Amino acid sequence: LHKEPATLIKAIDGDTVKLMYKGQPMTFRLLLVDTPETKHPKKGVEKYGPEASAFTKKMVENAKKIEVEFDKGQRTDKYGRGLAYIYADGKMVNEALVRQGLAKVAYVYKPNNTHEQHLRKSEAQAKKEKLNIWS
């Protein structure tokens, strides 16, 4: 996998952010995780939804550099959102969320699962420390 630069446009929620990529505005959906819903009515505003959003926001807004890393399978989901691992000053947002108990490992679709084990170890640690979601 290779990282490429992107510029923040706006953080939408814990797992969705709008970025300028290759000179174009796009919405990215974080690969392999799911932060609680703050938007869809069919879901409501789930617990930690707001916390997860704040965490991501803070993380991307305060970063010097943002980078996107596409996996080896499809790069967009059926809604047209780019599917990537996003890094803030070299720190993976996807993992930071899981490590804090602010997201669960979800939507594992081969071959897009290069960092699945890594994300899975962080999640177990978050679970064993009973953080947020796991509290």
Catalytic residues: 29, 37, 81
What count of other Cβ atoms lies within 10 Å of the Cβ of residue 4? 11
Q: Closest separation between CB of residue 29 and Ca ion, Å?
A: 8
Unique residue bearing structure tokens 């916390």: 51
Footprint of Ca ion on this chain (CB under 5 A)? 15, 34
Measured from the CB atom, the residue of 6 and 30 that comes closer to ligand THP is: 30
What is the rounded CA–CA span in Å between residue 98 and residue 79?
Answer: 24
Q: Is 89 annotated as a binding residue?
A: no
Contacts with ligand THP, 18-37, as mask; x by CB under 6 A? -----------x-x--x---
Q: CA–CA distance from 50 to each of 3, 15, 44, 45, 124 (Å)?
A: 28, 11, 12, 8, 22
What is the rounded CA–CA span in Å between residue 134 and residue 41?
Answer: 23
Q: Note whether 134 binds ligand THP by CB under 6 A.
A: no
- By CB under 6 A, the residues from 34 to 53 that bind ligand THP are 34
Measured from the CB atom, the residue of 43 and 130 that comes closer to ligand THP is: 43
What count of other Cβ atoms lies within 10 Å of the Cβ of residue 19? 22
Which residues bind to ligand THP, rule: CB under 6 A?
A: 15-16, 29, 31, 34, 77-78, 83, 107, 109, 112
